[PDB]
Symmetry: C2
Subunit: 517 residues, 2 copies
């Protein structure tokens, strides 16, 4: 309840924009201003209250307004080129999109430092960087070169690859930090850092930048758009004010600038390319788009190399799978009995230290095996789910009665044939004591007060018990292939046995005729 | 005589193209082992006297020292740009190793090449990657890719030539200059790119031929004074091409070529071919950028192929599930219950004929061939041993399939892994397709030494006996139907066997009763 309040704020409708830019939501045909950020009282010296129901020619000039009108006319606003303007002597980069039948235009203010930065030198290493990405033979080298290039172009002190887990919390796997700067490599972070609302927003918007954490938000006047009397939806607006709790969180970490690129794999937020600077500094949108493209290439290569690793595991298990299939096919006994004829091969097929083969009230145990009654209770629990195969690296997390034998069997890989007879094969992996590193208190994710982010950011050890070694993709693949081979061989055996009985029946028909003479 | 097209030793031409200089040297002291004869015109050095001499004699002390530092203890896979001004003519240096020797190639940069800069032509690189990831169609992907490649290279014609299984390839993307012949959709004979060329290009992913009228400049000494063999210019961009290919390019009307190998899983998926009506040289930086574009193209092709396969999977999931529910609650034979609704089985794969074989009864629905012919086909199909089979041209692999090619030209067969003869076959009728070929398919070359064909006109070839291609979703549906049939059949045979061996034992008891009398 109170924890769930972390995921209830309407971040999509903040009503304010960051001071590093200007916002203009306008009517499409005549480019009449619907709302304008209050920052125009300082920038360009225009009163935002009178700038209602007025064309862009009043403030932005005739030529630039005509250029914007030409660009936005009969265009999907997905391939708009660069737009740099000098408006009363201050330069803006213009980005255009549409929220609800209205044209939202953001002018990112380019400072002198941004002007000094050029797109040529920082993207000079583009082709070689992609060559390095394709030439990397390890995931760690991939991460290293990616964060190295991203730090090279951005210039930020710390760059992190923060991969999300299923439950919401994430882990940092790549780190590139400046000297005399705190390291977060390998640290886990609570799921409360990025709420569900933030993940949902970032699944669509793949680029966020916060140049400063001490900024005072500049409200949008009029607050309600005079078209539907609602709040402007700044979901895809780079000029969106962030929640003050996040600003306090960044201040507590000690960083004053952030820049994150969403990594998307199959429409899901796989991770974030987080960045951190000890001092405020702004990054131009062109460099942000280049970093976004680097992130998309990174996601593509991650998927490619994950498939490559899965295929490598399949290849290294093909020989053992073939040997086991040949042993099962030419056993003339029950399928699981012939499988159990060679226990060591079955063990090394999955790399587990315990094997339990169940066949209709007989259980055979090899290696480190629990009490047979406990395994029977577990198996009768496992068939309730109905899944053909099951892999669990933490049985006690999902199976409450698994705490008694967590020292012997903390990882369970089970596969069963689709027949009424209770049969199956279970592989048990023992618990490994792992001291998971967390950034702060795992049992106190949030300082409950308005919510306040935790000040402490030190590394905490958590000796997580009852968790065994992760089952690899090749492991479950081998389990499924063994299940498929058992399915095929068992079907062959039953059809042949019926045929032999049928042939014996035909032989018996010959015998009955012989028994009649 | 046709096979002579794939016998020339292209890897050892003994000559280099005149647009550059080659230096193969011993690694430690950078002493020249052999040098191309082109040095008689460029830099004005006699190639005969340039034996057993350090690079300092011709290339200068500073440039020799930089090359020595770069090549020392380096894999030559991340070498930065190397531009030198040697007696007033500019060279770009590339370094690699063929056989325990350092091969260094100086590509000559003309004034036109010097004027061209890597910045402007690659300014839209990040936008190009954004367009690649944002494209929702394969045709859009190809279009934007060839558009960018034509933009940087400036060549008149750009083609995406995808290879087929048999060796011949087809052009799927075309970007041609005005008043220039179009090859969109045209098939090309496999003799255009022999097996040797494909094998060489599987390793070297970048080839450029600026001119077709060039006279090769021989390498002196021809044999290295280390192993008395020919230098292996496999990864050398300065390699002379076969004169037959030069004549082929002249016959096509192009005088410049530039190809990037597309690699998918270690296989030559296709080539990004290019064509210019006049000689023109492309700098190595733009070639490397095009290579990176090609690798990204291959990655996105694989990604979108997986996406299309998954879309087909989703659209067939409902039909597969409905058939599974109908099959599970039939209490009859598995294929009989499947055949209870023939139209649904037909629309599962989109075929016009269904043949279900169950123990000497064959049931035909829709456009079905002669039952004897289908039985012969089925007994031929089990010989291969594949669990599933898809063929879009049965007469190509089944000689007796020509009689019914009008009715069944596409066969999708799936059988259970049991000795008992059972199975499901889907038949697709022949569609008359006029395949377009560039020239004579039966006469690739005008045999007179092999000579490339002069004619490059579009030829219609009415290929009969070919049905519609079976999609990836089609074979996916076949395998899932096979899996569901496997599970249900195993359940049914296990149940019948449970209540079957009892009768056999009873018969034995009956026999025992009939024996004790
Ligand atoms: C219960 C509420 C909390 C809260 C909410 C919150 N946080 C964000 C934004 C972000 N938080 C991030 C977390 C990290 N930054 C890092 O550097 C690391 C690791 C080293 C982590 C785990 C990130 C990356 C974001 C996105 C913004 C960015 O930094 O680029 C939001 C979203 C706000 C918005 O988008 O307007 C919200 C609502 N965070 C907490 O920690 C608690 C107090
Ligand atoms: C029997 C011998 C033949 C011969 C041999 C041959 N051809 C090449 C090189 C290439 N041929 C290519 C074919 C095409 N170019 C196009 O523009 C199109 C389509 C519009 C096609 C099908 C290509 C792309 C190459 C690679 C070179 C390039 O253009 O970049 C070789 C290889 C030579 C070498 O690498 O040294 C050889 C041995 N070609 C024939 O047509 C017959 C006569």
């Amino acid at each position: 309840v109170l924890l769930a309040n972390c995921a209830d704020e309407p971040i999509q409708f903040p009503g304010a924009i960051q001071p590093h830019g200007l916002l203009f939501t306008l009517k499409e045909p005549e480019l009449t201003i619907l709302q304008v950020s209050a920052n125009v009282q300082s920038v360009l010296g225009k009163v935002p209250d009178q700038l209602a129901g007025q064309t862009l020619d009043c403030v932005l000039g005739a030529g630039w307004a005509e250029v914007i009108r030409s660009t936005s006319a009969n265009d999907s606003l997905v391939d708009v080129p660069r737009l740099l303007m000098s408006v009363e002597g201050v330069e803006f980069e213009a980005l255009l999109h549409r929220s609800q039948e209205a044209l939202v235009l953001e002018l990112e203010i380019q400072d002198k430092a941004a002007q000094a930065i050029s797109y040529s030198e920082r993207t000079g290493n583009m082709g070689r960087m992609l060559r390095q990405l394709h030439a990397a033979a390890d995931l760690q080298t991939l991460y290293e070169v990616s964060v190295r290039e991203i730090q090279r172009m951005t210039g930020y002190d710390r760059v992190l690859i923060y991969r999300f887990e299923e439950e919401g919390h994430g882990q940092v796997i790549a780190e590139a930090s400046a000297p005399a700067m705190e390291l977060f490599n390998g640290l886990f972070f609570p799921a409360s850092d990025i709420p569900e609302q933030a993940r949902e927003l970032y699944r669509r918007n793949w680029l966020r930048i916060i140049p400063d954490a001490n900024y005072t938000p500049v409200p949008l006047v009029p607050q309600l758009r005079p078209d539907t009397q609602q709040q402007l939806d700044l979901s895809f607006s780079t000029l969106r004010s962030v929640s003050p709790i996040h600003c306090q969180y960044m201040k507590n970490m000690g960083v004053l600038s952030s820049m994150s690129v969403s990594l998307i794999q199959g429409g899901k937020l796989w991770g974030l390319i987080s960045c951190g600077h000890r001092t405020p500094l702004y990054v131009s949108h062109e460099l942000r788009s280049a970093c976004q493209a680097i992130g998309q290439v990174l996601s593509l290569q991650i998927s490619a190399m994950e498939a490559l690793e899965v295929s490598r595991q399949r290849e290294t298990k093909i020989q053992t799978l073939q040997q086991l299939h040949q042993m099962m096919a030419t056993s003339d006994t029950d399928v699981f009995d012939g499988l159990a004829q060679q226990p060591q091969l079955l063990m090394d097929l999955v790399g587990a230290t315990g094997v339990a083969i169940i066949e209709d009230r007989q259980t055979h145990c090899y290696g480190n095996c629990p009490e047979p009654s406990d395994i029977r209770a577990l198996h009768t629990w496992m068939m309730a789910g109905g899944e053909p195969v099951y892999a669990s690296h933490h049985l006690s997390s999902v199976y409450p009665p698994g705490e008694a034998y967590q020292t012997l069997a903390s990882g369970v890989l089970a596969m069963s044939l689709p027949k009424p007879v209770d049969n199956g094969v279970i592989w048990f992996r023992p618990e490994v004591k792992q001291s998971v590193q967390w950034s702060g208190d795992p049992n106190k994710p949030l300082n409950l007060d308005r919510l306040q982010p935790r000040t402490s950011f030190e590394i905490w050890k958590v000796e997580m018990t009852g968790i065994a070694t992760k089952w690899s993709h090749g492991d479950v693949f081998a389990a499924n292939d063994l299940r498929r081979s058992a399915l095929e061989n068992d079907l062959a055996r039953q059809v042949s046995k019926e045929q032999q009985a049928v042939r014996a029946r035909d032989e018996l028909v010959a015998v009955v005729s012989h028994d009649l003479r």
